[PDB]
């Protein structure tokens, strides 16, 4: 239970905050390195730097002096040097030709008792330096000590978005070996904007030389005792306790035990006696991937906006565009755009959302009547030709084209319905050529006195007023019901992986699940397939067109039987859908009941009164 740092910076007080970050796995397996003369064992291997490093150092004589972080460490790439020389702290980012065996040297004079730094053998050359820092001068002790280890120094190193982040804490100790017990949170120390690709690192130590160290440069050297421990940063979720002063005083590793998982779910450090449903074997998600349609195959906005002929208003043209990445660059007046209303939905922020089958309706109307294309209008257009629903979630687009629709003779091929029996239900097209009976004359389609013809042409002339001109109109209608894998605003995607617990986000549907190859065959009009519980259990994905099934990182029934945290920490687990293996741990005392498989409890042949109900007649208790 070491290395719980401060994830964020927002000052909190007495508010338990569940967080998903990179932390030390509780009771993990750390590597241990020595500097013990007795063997020499001047350990300084090059180690991996996977996702961040926990570095602990037990010292009494300032042997561990710094680190170098990099990828190749050979002047072809850039490396970071963090060193503590006898006088300053030096942080440099350059192209170093590091030595194969870097170290520092302290020499001891017998005639006058004094330890002073003589050697600095770390790199040959450093050429292109981008970042540099030198601290204010100090004098360090450097004296060799004889007791046991007196100082523990803990560091956490992270590399995120071009920032190298360092947390640290110092603690007094009195021990001889191993990493000690206890808890202490590290505090933020520094945040360096280096912008390099660290993959490996190497520890920088110091040497002792005297008159008792006889030899050449490569053999006349002793070591001085010191030890250091290296741990890595895996993704996991934790519960943190903030107290009234703002310090982290306790933590729960939410994936250590089923008991810890119940603690994490209840968001408390105390669990009462009962049955708590943790999950089946649960693996914290290690990754997250997103997949949206490829950035090609745009919607045919051209075939709706730039067309040769638009239909008349009595029989408008309706089109359904789907399975495209619509970009909404039309709003800019790239061509003439007289109007842009967009009731109900903002076009600016519309891009970020994923919609279903945005219908486009196209027609040609006269100049005055463009207003009548709105929710709640009362006119010949909005009573017998084209009627908008009261609640509208779309976008009315109207522009003027006098040059295409005004023949000097007159474009009389555009017509509209004048006489109708009753008003039009929303979005109903009634294309008929009957003879309207305006009076009690049964005229049997002869267009006589009191019988008219509903359709009547439009008079269009170039030498005419603005009010009586031809305006072309297009009405975008956005709807959203189910299966939204059709229209989706342009967004980049990542790679696809199989067989892990990964956060998935497909065409606007997110989740955390294992992806596997599926034998399911989807008809062309479907993308999402659901099981009996309705939870999405299938996905197609446009780029690969390959069916993928969705498994919750836990499937089955689980219940944890606890005597009470006050009494004990021992707990039993019941798996409701296992016949005794889909269990967290087998242990011993595996007992089968009609309620499921019970692990962690001893079965007795007595029959007492019920203490803790398990089910199907089975009860549990905490006895001697």
């Amino acid at each position, epitope marked *: 239970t070491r290395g719980v740092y401060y994830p964020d910076k927002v000052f*909190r007080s007495s508010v338990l905050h569940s967080t998903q970050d990179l932390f030390l796995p509780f009771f993990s397996n750390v590597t241990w390195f020595h500097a013990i003369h007795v063997t020499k064992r001047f350990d300084n291997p090059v180690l991996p730097f996977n996702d961040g490093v926990y570095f602990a150092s037990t010292e009494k004589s300032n042997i561990i002096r710094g680190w170098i972080f990099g990828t190749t460490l050979d002047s072809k790439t850039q490396s970071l040097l963090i060193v503590n020389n006898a006088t300053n702290v030096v942080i440099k980012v350059c192209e170093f030709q590091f030595c194969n065996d870097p170290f520092l040297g302290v020499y001891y004079h017998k005639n006058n008792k004094s330890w002073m730094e003589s050697e600095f053998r770390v790199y040959s050359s450093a050429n292109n330096c981008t970042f540099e820092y030198v601290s204010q001068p100090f004098l360090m002790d450097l004296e060799g000590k004889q007791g046991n280890f007196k100082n523990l120094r803990e560091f956490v190193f992270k590399n995120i978005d071009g920032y190298f982040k360092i947390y640290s804490k110092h603690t007094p100790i009195n021990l001889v070996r191993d990493l000690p017990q206890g808890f202490s949170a590290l505090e933020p120390l520094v945040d360096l904007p280096i912008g390099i690709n660290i993959t490996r690192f190497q520890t920088l130590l110091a040497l002792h030389r005297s008159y008792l160290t006889p030899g050449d440069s490569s053999s006349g050297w002793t070591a001085g005792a010191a030890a250091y421990y290296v741990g890595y940063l895996q993704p996991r979720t934790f519960l943190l306790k903030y107290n009234e002063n703002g310090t982290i005083t306790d933590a729960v590793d939410c994936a250590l035990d089923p008991l810890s998982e119940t603690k994490c779910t209840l968001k408390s450090f105390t669990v009462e006696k009962g049955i708590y449903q943790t999950s089946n074997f649960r693996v914290q998600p290690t990754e997250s991937i997103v997949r949206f349609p490829n950035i090609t195959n745009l919607c045919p906005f051209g075939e709706v906006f730039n067309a040769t002929r638009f239909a008349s208003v009595y029989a408008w043209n309706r089109k359904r565009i789907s399975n495209c990445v619509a970009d909404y660059s039309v709003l800019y007046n790239s061509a003439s755009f007289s109007t842009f*209303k967009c009731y*109900g939905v903002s076009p600016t922020k519309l891009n970020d959302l994923c919609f279903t089958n945005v219908y486009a309706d196209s027609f040609v109307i006269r100049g005055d009547e463009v207003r009548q294309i709105a929710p709640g209008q009362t006119g010949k257009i909005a009573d017998y030709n084209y009627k908008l629903p009261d609640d509208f979630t779309g976008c009315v687009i109207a522009w003027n084209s006098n040059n295409l629709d005004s023949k000097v003779g007159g474009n009389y091929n555009y017509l509209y319905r004048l006489f109708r029996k009753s008003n039009l239900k929303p979005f109903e097209r009634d294309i008929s050529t009957e003879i309207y009976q305006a009076g009690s004359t049964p005229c049997n389609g002869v267009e006589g006195f009191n019988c008219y013809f509903p359709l009547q042409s439009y008079g269009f002339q170039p030498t005419n007023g603005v009010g009586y001109q031809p305006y072309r109109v297009v009405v975008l209608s956005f709807e*959203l019901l189910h299966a939204p894998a059709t229209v989706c605003g342009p967004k980049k995607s990542t790679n696809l992986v199989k067989n892990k617990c990964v956060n998935f986000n497909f065409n606007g549907l997110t989740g955390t699940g294992v992806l596997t190859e599926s034998n399911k065959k989807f008809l062309p009009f479907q993308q999402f397939g659901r099981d009996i519980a309705d939870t999405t259990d299938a996905v197609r994905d446009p780029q690969t067109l390959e069916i993928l099934d969705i498994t919750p990182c836990s499937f089955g029934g689980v219940s944890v039987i606890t005597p009470g945290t006050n009494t004990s920490n021992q707990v039993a687990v019941l798996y409701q859908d296992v016949n005794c293996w889909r269990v967290y741990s087998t242990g011993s005392n595996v007992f089968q009941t009609r309620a499921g498989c019970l692990i962690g409890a001893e079965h007795v042949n007595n029959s007492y009164e019920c203490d803790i109900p398990i089910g199907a007649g089975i009860c549990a208790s905490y006895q001697t």
Partner: antibody
Amino acid sequence: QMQLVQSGTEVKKPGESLKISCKGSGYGFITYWIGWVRQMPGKGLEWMGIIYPGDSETRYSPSFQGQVTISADKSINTAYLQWSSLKASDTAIYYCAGGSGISTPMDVWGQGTTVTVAS
Amino acid sequence: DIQLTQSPDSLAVSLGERATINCKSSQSVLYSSINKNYLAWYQQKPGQPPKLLIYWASTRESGVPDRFSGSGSGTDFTLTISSLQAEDVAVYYCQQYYSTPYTFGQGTKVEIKR
């Protein structure tokens, strides 16, 4: 995101006529429904009116209906709020804010212009 | 035509504590077509224009920190600040934008405590 710049601070005696301009600068200004809001000293906001630049469809509030006039000029992308005869109770700060459509929250707010009417 | 109500008027909490503000509407403001609540939360600092904070009563505008959360349904909506900081002391307004005219909230003043 197109920013709105307001005209400025005017001090007037009672009985005058007052015109306040809201200027809209930025790309994409083809669908922004301009609206006006008045904040009396140390009180909550009270929405007044909304006009579409161009078409000039104008929707008012029942309390302010006919007290003031909201008009728009499309060529230079401006909105004008006019008082025919401002009284002595009109000292307050006015903000012009532009939504992107009808039934859309107002996200871009102009600085705002105070009005003082007194001796 | 649909007046709103807020509560509490003035609330004092310590640094790092939660803060809950409640907005109540006369009638449900749910759009049938898209099934999205129409209600927004605004922040105003003394001497500056208000800023959008939450729209649709569940989504956050770009750049708003996670601390600010919005929840609720039917007619009852709430804004929760998980942990308050030294920059959030201000006045918060709940506005409904379903049908014109757009009514505003009374306004809640958030101040720290010593």
